[PDB]
Amino acid sequence: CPGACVCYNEPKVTTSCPQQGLQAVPVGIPAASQRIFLHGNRISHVPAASFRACRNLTILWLHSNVLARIDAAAFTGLALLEQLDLSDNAQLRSVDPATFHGLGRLHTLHLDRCGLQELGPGLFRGLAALQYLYLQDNALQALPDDTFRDLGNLTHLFLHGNRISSVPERAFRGLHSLDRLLLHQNRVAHVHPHAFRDLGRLMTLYLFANNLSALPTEALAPLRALQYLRLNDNPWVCDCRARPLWAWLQKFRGSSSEVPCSLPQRLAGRDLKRLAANDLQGCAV
Ligand SMILES: CC(=O)N[C@@H]1[C@@H](O)[C@H](O)[C@@H](CO)O[C@@H]1O
Numbered sequence: 001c002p003g004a005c006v007c008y009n010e011p012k013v014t015t016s017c018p019q020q021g022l023q024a025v026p027v028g029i030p031a032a033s034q035r036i037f038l039h040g041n042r043i044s045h046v047p048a049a050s051f052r053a054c055r056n057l058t059i060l061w062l063h064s065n066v067l068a069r070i071d072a073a074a075f076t077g078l079a080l081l082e083q084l085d086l087s088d089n090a091q092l093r094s095v096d097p098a099t100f101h102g103l104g105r106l107h108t109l110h111l112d113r114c115g116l117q118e119l120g121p122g123l124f125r126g127l128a129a130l131q132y133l134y135l136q137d138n139a140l141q142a143l144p145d146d147t148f149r150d151l152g153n154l155t156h157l158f159l160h161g162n163r164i165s166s167v168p169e170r171a172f173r174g175l176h177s178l179d180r181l182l183l184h185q186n187r188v189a190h191v192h193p194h195a196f197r198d199l200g201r202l203m204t205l206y207l208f209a210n211n212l213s214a215l216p217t218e219a220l221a222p223l224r225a226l227q228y229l230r231l232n233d234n235p236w237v238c239d240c241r242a243r244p245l246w247a248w249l250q251k252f253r254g255s256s257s258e259v260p261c262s263l264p265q266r267l268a269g270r271d272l273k274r275l276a277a278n279d280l281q282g283c284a285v
């Protein structure tokens, strides 16, 4: 086994060379390795077919490594790959759309704390098996249509800490079985109704800290079975336009947060969840 690593077959075959100051992926990683650990090094690249001979690789960790570019090939024969953590590489900024193409059995994929500015075309094409998909704290500006379409088992989608400015119909389409997506700490101005139009089964949604003035009507409608909704820290305007949300909150059985009206004044500071129906004026004008 390569130096600066410990190798064992014990539970599953591991290579493990974490925090060993490695500058690049060592050449001698034994092929019949099941799980490989390379986080905490200084590996700045994942060149084409870096783990090819490891046909039985289940777990692979490269997080916290000053990654800069990950060859479109990279994970090529890692068909049995389950977890692939590339988190904490604020210098990556991007992943060639065809990168994860194979990765069928992929269960969990971490791409958080990465300079990801955009989510390319088929970045997540047919990742079917995927359930956990971490994408918090990147530079993502928008969620383009059908971006998570093929992700049918996805039950955990984290997108907070980005720069998403709005949620269009397209995004979150095939996301059936999605149990909880967080969108907090984003710049969400508008949430197109129907945007959650098959986002049922969803257990918990987060939209706090987001620059939302008021939510459309049919917006929270599909969220039958929702149990946790966090809407604090938003410029909630409270005029007749808030009725739909006001209403949706009253009939809500689950657990909500505080929806602080931050406008108009005179009502400013009060929480929409406790305003009486006729507190919302300034109608059709
Ligand atoms: C809860 C559910 O729908 N189970 C299926 C599972 O049978 C299948 O193996 C997987 C694909 O890897 O998709 C879904 O997770």
Ligand SMILES: CC(=O)N[C@@H]1[C@@H](O)[C@H](O)[C@@H](CO)O[C@H]1O
Pocket: 031, 032, 033, 055, 056
């Ligand atoms: C545990 C098991 O199924 N055995 C195979 C083994 O025959 C093969 O040599 C190896 C490739 O390195 O992949 C393993 O999965």
